RNA sequence: CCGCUGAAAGCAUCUAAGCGGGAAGCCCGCCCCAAGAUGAGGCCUCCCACGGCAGCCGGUAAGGACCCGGGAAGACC
RNA sequence: UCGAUGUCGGCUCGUCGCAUCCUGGGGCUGAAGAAGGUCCCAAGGGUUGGGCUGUUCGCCCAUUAAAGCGGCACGCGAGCU
């Protein structure tokens, strides 16, 4: 007898509020959903996971002096192009990217996990234009 | 301000402080004033 | 040997109504609002206000005397209101009242005009003395400190801006 | 943030108070507003200006159409003047008084694939004492094995010129309404008869 | 670095709650590029609902490309 | 690494470190003032031209806001000498 392989499955849409929630300890549930490792039919080489619609992403909470001491960084390719960006300002500029960048790193590397991040959609504020999907809100 | 690894009290008037994770030493004699660095 | 326990003699007729995280005060001179730690408790008694900490942990001992003194200060403010006199020392150094603002003539290449923020009201009984007055303390306290910074006291001369009752400790030249 | 599209005729000099003032002349006006950008509709404020009437035989349907919704005659060129809202249907140099200041934009002359002593002002090698075929060469482009690579943004020979250049704080010397001519003291990029924008200055 | 208010620690303390001042340096602003930004964005106008049997073949539309006369554009492109 | 990794100095071209030469912001000063001395913050930009010598370096002339020290195989010979 062989192992079960699930035919194409209509994905499910989830809605997760992040207000008050702790950063890194939220992105661990998302990525899990994305991976689909909450499904009895999990399969490693397919996008058999939820889509995750995160909201109020500007209200994520964090422990300690991280707003002042967590340094998001970029390298502009050229010399001296090391951009050091504190957490405080990423929010006061592009907040939906504090969570994104967090989950992003919790998703595998290569193509698959690179198109699972696509299934992640994190918006700042209490609303999302994905109403036409009727997302199944979750509590975690 | 003095800056050194040997912050100590120089007179009866000096006072040892911890401020912002740092150890200063204030006094009415501005000389004795120290920081630990 | 303790402040957070010392009661706060609310003098009639000044009001005090508690609200989680804060306390609001009304007086003959103006309202005030004291943001306060939730962990504490503000207790209302007849013509008296106290504050109880829930434990003897260091972090509760600290915020305790703190909170008592804030509220206490906020009461004297809305009732007596605070003030501070500034002393001007310097031959050509003046200080006259411009309608409501304050210009200081203290030797710079120009007069230093300072606009009074809210709550604060400048006054000048003498072109040498200045009295900053308000209901808040860390504001009357600040502004004055700012004005003194324009032309601080010197180390070699009674010449500059001095807090009232501020020592005139000077050094020798030559 | 007033601005106007225009072409470059040339540059001479004039006299102003016993003093010679180099000037470059520009045929700025007249530019008709062919569309107004908005925050609700387009999400931002500007004004699409037209300049130089064009022969309708060379103008095609979508363009001909767009020129219609604005009740605007055809034209040769279309550029925007961001954060600018003229009260009327037509813009002219009259929006500039003498003695003002402006920032000028022009597609600089094109020097083609120019060398390094010409694009990046290098000094090349000597012309003697043993120079072996390097009189106009750059030199060394890196180190050795560490980093063992060449930098990005490095300076090398390449196309130089014929690129957008914005000159700033020029002086409105005079404006000739009669002809739509703006006189500006200084150098304006690009060849004569080339296109230029004349936007209010952002300096102080 | 300099402070305001201020406990712990009845005084004192720029800090432990909180609020200020302060570098040619960090962020934005200025100039230039840039939606291959595959997160491939937005706006204006134009075209259309063609025949035969999310594919194919054939003829058009709005358009473009080749060809040519050339250009302070350019090695060819 | 010797079935080869060419080794000093210069020219050209940079770029980084900061134990900072300059410009900036501070404390102390036996800081009156001007000008100095000594620690602290700061690497954005700048840091000249010459005479001797192969020279790096150093000395010297004239200046300067100043004429900083160092890493990149004592940066850089399929780039030159
Ligand atoms: Mg779960
Ligand atoms: Mg697991
Ligand atoms: Mg998935
Ligand atoms: Mg946390
Ligand atoms: Mg954003
Ligand atoms: Mg000692
Ligand atoms: Mg002693
Ligand atoms: Mg003291
Ligand atoms: Mg009462
Ligand atoms: Mg009780
Ligand atoms: Mg012209
Ligand atoms: Mg142009
Ligand atoms: Mg050319
Ligand atoms: Mg050049
Ligand atoms: Mg040259
Ligand atoms: Mg040369
Ligand atoms: Mg030579
Ligand atoms: Mg030469
Ligand atoms: Mg030879
Ligand atoms: Mg030769
Ligand atoms: Mg070369
Ligand atoms: Mg080589
Ligand atoms: Mg490498
Ligand atoms: Mg080009
Ligand atoms: Mg004239
Ligand atoms: Mg003090
Ligand atoms: Mg105090
Ligand atoms: Mg604090
Ligand atoms: Mg501040
Ligand atoms: Mg501040
Ligand atoms: Mg101050
Ligand atoms: Mg500030
Ligand atoms: Mg400057
Ligand atoms: Mg562009
Ligand atoms: Mg596109
Ligand atoms: Mg990306
Ligand atoms: Mg598009
Ligand atoms: Mg040709
Ligand atoms: Mg070998
Ligand atoms: Mg060998
Ligand atoms: Mg070999
Ligand atoms: Mg070999
Ligand atoms: Mg240092
Ligand atoms: Mg300095
Ligand atoms: Mg200095
Ligand atoms: Mg002296
Ligand atoms: Mg002296
Ligand atoms: Mg001095
Ligand atoms: Mg000093
Ligand atoms: Mg620097
Ligand atoms: Mg330098
Ligand atoms: Mg020399
Ligand atoms: Mg000689
Ligand atoms: Mg020697
Ligand atoms: Mg000698
Ligand atoms: Mg001199
Ligand atoms: Mg000096
Ligand atoms: Mg060696
Ligand atoms: Mg050696
Ligand atoms: Mg070598
Ligand atoms: Mg070499
Ligand atoms: Mg050679
Ligand atoms: Mg050599
Ligand atoms: Zn002392």
Swiss-Prot record, chain A:
What are its GO cellular component terms?
A: cytosolic large ribosomal subunit
User: Biological process (GO) annotations?
Assistant: negative regulation of translation; translation
InterPro entries, A to Z: Ribosomal_uL13, Ribosomal_uL13_bac-type, Ribosomal_uL13_CS, Ribosomal_uL13_sf
Spell out the Gene3D superfamilies in the cross-references: Ribosomal protein L13
Keyword list (alphabetical) reads: Ribonucleoprotein, Ribosomal protein
- Main role? This protein is one of the early assembly proteins of the 50S ribosomal subunit, although it is not seen to bind rRNA by itself. It is important during the early stages of 50S assembly.
Q: How does it assemble?
A: Part of the 50S ribosomal subunit.
UniProt-recorded name of the protein = Large ribosomal subunit protein uL13
Specify the species: Thermus thermophilus (strain ATCC 27634 / DSM 579 / HB8)
UniProtKB/Swiss-Prot annotation, chain B:
Q: Does the keyword Zinc apply?
A: yes
**What protein am I looking at?**
Large ribosomal subunit protein bL36
Molecular function (GO) terms for this protein are: metal ion binding; structural constituent of ribosome
Q: Which SUPFAM superfamilies match?
A: Ribosomal protein L36
Q: Where does Zn(2+) bind?
A: 11, 14, 27, 32
- Give the organism the record lists: Thermus thermophilus (strain ATCC 27634 / DSM 579 / HB8)
Which family is this protein grouped under? Belongs to the bacterial ribosomal protein bL36 family.
- The reply to whether Transcription regulation figures as a keyword in the UniProt entry is no
What is said about its interaction partners and assembly?
Part of the 50S ribosomal subunit.
Q: Which gene encodes it?
A: rpmJ
Classification via NCBIfam families:
rpmJ_bact
Cofactor notes? Binds 1 zinc ion per subunit.
Q: Which GO terms describe its biological process?
A: translation
Q: Which UniProt keywords apply?
A: Metal-binding, Ribonucleoprotein, Ribosomal protein, Zinc
Pfam families assigned to the protein according to its UniProt record, in alphabetical order? Ribosomal_L36
UniProtKB/Swiss-Prot annotation, chain C:
Cite the entry's keywords alphabetically: Ribonucleoprotein, Ribosomal protein, RNA-binding, rRNA-binding
One of the protein's GO biological processes: cytoplasmic translation
Gene3D superfamilies tied to this protein: Ribosomal protein L6, alpha-beta domain (3.90.930.12)
- Known SUPFAM superfamilies for this protein? Ribosomal protein L6
Cellular component, GO annotation? cytosolic large ribosomal subunit
InterPro entries in UniProt? Ribosomal_uL6-like, Ribosomal_uL6-like_a/b-dom_sf, Ribosomal_uL6_a/b-dom, Ribosomal_uL6_bac-type
Instruction: Cite a single Pfam family from the UniProt record.
Output: Ribosomal_L6
An example of a GO molecular function for this protein is: structural constituent of ribosome
Question: How does the record describe its quaternary structure?
Answer: Part of the 50S ribosomal subunit.
HAMAP family given for it? Ribosomal_uL6_B
What is stated as this protein's family in its record?
Answer: Belongs to the universal ribosomal protein uL6 family.
Q: What does the function comment of this entry state?
A: This protein binds to the 23S rRNA, and is important in its secondary structure. It is located near the subunit interface in the base of the L7/L12 stalk, and near the tRNA binding site of the peptidyltransferase center.
Protein name (database record): Large ribosomal subunit protein uL6
The gene is rplF
Curated annotation (Swiss-Prot), chain D:
Official protein name in the record: Large ribosomal subunit protein uL3
Gene that produces this protein: rplC
Which residues pair up as cystines?
none
Q: How does it assemble?
A: Part of the 50S ribosomal subunit. Forms a cluster with proteins L14 and L19.
Q: Does the keyword Membrane apply?
A: no
The record's keywords, sorted A to Z, are:
Methylation, Ribonucleoprotein, Ribosomal protein, RNA-binding, rRNA-binding
- Recorded family membership: Belongs to the universal ribosomal protein uL3 family.
Q: How is it modified after translation?
A: The mass differences between the observed and calculated masses are suggested to be due to methylation, which is known to occur in the E.coli and R.palustris orthologs.
Biological role stated in the UniProt entry: One of the primary rRNA binding proteins, it binds directly near the 3'-end of the 23S rRNA, where it nucleates assembly of the 50S subunit.
Xref: InterPro entries: Ribosomal_uL3 (IPR000597), Ribosomal_uL3_bac/org-type (IPR019927), Ribosomal_uL3_CS (IPR019926), Transl_B-barrel_sf (IPR009000)
User: Listed GO cellular component terms?
Assistant: cytosolic large ribosomal subunit
State whether keyword Ribonucleoprotein applies: yes
Alphabetically, the GO molecular function entries are: rRNA binding; structural constituent of ribosome
A biological-process GO annotation: translation
Q: Which domain of life is it from?
A: Bacteria
